[PDB]
Amino acid sequence: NLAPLPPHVPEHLVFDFDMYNPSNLSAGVQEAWAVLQESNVPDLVWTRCNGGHWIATRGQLIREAYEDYRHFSSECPFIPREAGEAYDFIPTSMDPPEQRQFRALANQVVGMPVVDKLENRIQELACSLIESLRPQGQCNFTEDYAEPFPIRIFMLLAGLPEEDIPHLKYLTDQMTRPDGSMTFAEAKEALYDYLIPIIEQRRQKPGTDAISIVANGQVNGRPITSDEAKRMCGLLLVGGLDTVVNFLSFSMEFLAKSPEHRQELIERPERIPAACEELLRRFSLVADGRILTSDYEFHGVQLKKGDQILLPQMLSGLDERENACPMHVDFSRQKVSHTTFGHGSHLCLGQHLARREIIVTLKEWLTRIPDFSIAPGAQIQHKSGIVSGVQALPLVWDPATTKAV
Numbered sequence: 001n002l003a004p005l006p007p008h009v010p011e012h013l014v015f016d017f018d019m020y021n022p023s024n025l026s027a028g029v030q031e032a033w034a035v036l037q038e039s040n041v042p043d044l045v046w047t048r049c050n051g052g053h054w055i056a057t058r059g060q061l062i063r064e065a066y067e068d069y070r071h072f073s074s075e076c077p078f079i080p081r082e083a084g085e086a087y088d089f090i091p092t093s094m095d096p097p098e099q100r101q102f103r104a105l106a107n108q109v110v111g112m113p114v115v116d117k118l119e120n121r122i123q124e125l126a127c128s129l130i131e132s133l134r135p136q137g138q139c140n141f142t143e144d145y146a147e148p149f150p151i152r153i154f155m156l157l158a159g160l161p162e163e164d165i166p167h168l169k170y171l172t173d174q175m176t177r178p179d180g181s182m183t184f185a186e187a188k189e190a191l192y193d194y195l196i197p198i199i200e201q202r203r204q205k206p207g208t209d210a211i212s213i214v215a216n217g218q219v220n221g222r223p224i225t226s227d228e229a230k231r232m233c234g235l236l237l238v239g240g241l242d243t244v245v246n247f248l249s250f251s252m253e254f255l256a257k258s259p260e261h262r263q264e265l266i267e268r269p270e271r272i273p274a275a276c277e278e279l280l281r282r283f284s285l286v287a288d289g290r291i292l293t294s295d296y297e298f299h300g301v302q303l304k305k306g307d308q309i310l311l312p313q314m315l316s317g318l319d320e321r322e323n324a325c326p327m328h329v330d331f332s333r334q335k336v337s338h339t340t341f342g343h344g345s346h347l348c349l350g351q352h353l354a355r356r357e358i359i360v361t362l363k364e365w366l367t368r369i370p371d372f373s374i375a376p377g378a379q380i381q382h383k384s385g386i387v388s389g390v391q392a393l394p395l396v397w398d399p400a401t402t403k404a405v
């Protein structure tokens with residue numbers, strides 16, 4: 001279902017990519033998107049899928065568009081338009097200078113000092129989950145670790161019940177990897193129905209949890225309103241449930257196929273941090289965009305006011321003009337260039353949390369289960385969207401090679 005080409009779009013600029021169902025998904029998600037960077041594709045294309053939008057395909061362009069909030073506005077950051085329209089998360093749906101106050105608050109909750117404080121729990125849960133899997137010789141990494149690990153840590157931080165997971169997760173998924181089961185507005189609404197009561201409760205009887213801090217926070221000298229906290233929390237929620245979760249599966253699928261990368265990390269542990277960055281580059285997974293605030297000519301292409309453009313954070317570090325041999329994982333690169341956690345005034349506040357969770361998982365997994373692989377005859381399937389994922393990841397290992405700690 002391609003939408004009629006608008007009048008201002010040169011036919012030569014057309015490239016019908018479907019961000020929800022790219023063509024060589026079988027090959028891997030990062031690989032399917034990378035088709036955008038082939039010599040035959042102009043740097044800035046127009047796709048007729050999902051109602052029609054621009055896509056920047058190169059690091060240089062994505063970064064410029066990200067810096068440029070005057071022209072490229074966060075008001076409508078999701079594609080399709082209905083989604084972008086219904087999107088009202090804070091701070092993500094705001095441009096500077098407005099964004100800055102809400103960002104300051106979100107930081108109080110997810111920032112550096114919070115991670116430092118939660119560090120021992122993170123390590124505690126990782127080790128527990130792994131040790132529990134270890135003797136089994138087999139898991140579903142996605143359902144067995146990648147989901148529980150990050151989510152339980154978040155539920156804790158947010159002071160929310162683990163029983164709510166199933167429900168919240170379904171709604172979060174609907175927003176990034178739409179299923180057809182519900183529209184974006186419906187999904188946002190159900191999440192909002194959830195939060196409202198909880199925020200109410202915490203405005204009256206404050207805790208020390210994330211939600212309590214948000215609901216009682218100060219923005220621009222005055223007190224945050226209720227709709228405002230609702231909208232911040234809604235974002236924290238998607239960040240908590242949907243990001244780290246997917247990333248670990250990409251990375252673990254990779255480790256499962258690369259004995260030499262595993263070994264490298266085992267003998268030369270000082271490399272984990274470097275390795276983590278390299279995986280964040282190669283297994284980048286978020287794609288959102290911006291809306292034109294006006295007609296603007298960008299790299300000789302005429303953008304019209306109201307046009308949405310997808311600026312795939314995922315594409316930046318996959319760009320050969322940025323990283324030599326991009327599809328190849330090399331823990332010893334002189335420079336790992338990516339925009340995995342975004343660029344401009346919107347940089348991930350939760351990046352520090354995300355990194356700690358990754359680094360712990362690698363260290364702790366490898367310590368106990370040094371040798372593992374993909375289950376024989378399992379076909380790993382990727383999923384595309386705003387946040388890309390792995391459907392399921394069946395692993396196998398010989399318990400005799402594991403190490404209890």
Ligand code: HEM
Pocket residue numbers: 077090091092103106110235236237239240243244247285286288289313339340341342343345346347348349350351353354
């Ligand atoms: C692998 C992990 C993650 C990735 C790749 C990721 C990626 C990103 C991206 C690309 C953006 C910018 C979006 C835009 O410019 O439209 C963003 C923003 C945001 N992320 Fe994440 N994220 C991750 C984990 C987290 C976590 C764990 C949290 C918190 C629980 C979180 C919270 C946020 C917040 C609060 C913002 C908005 C910041 C602002 O507007 O200033 N993310 N993230």
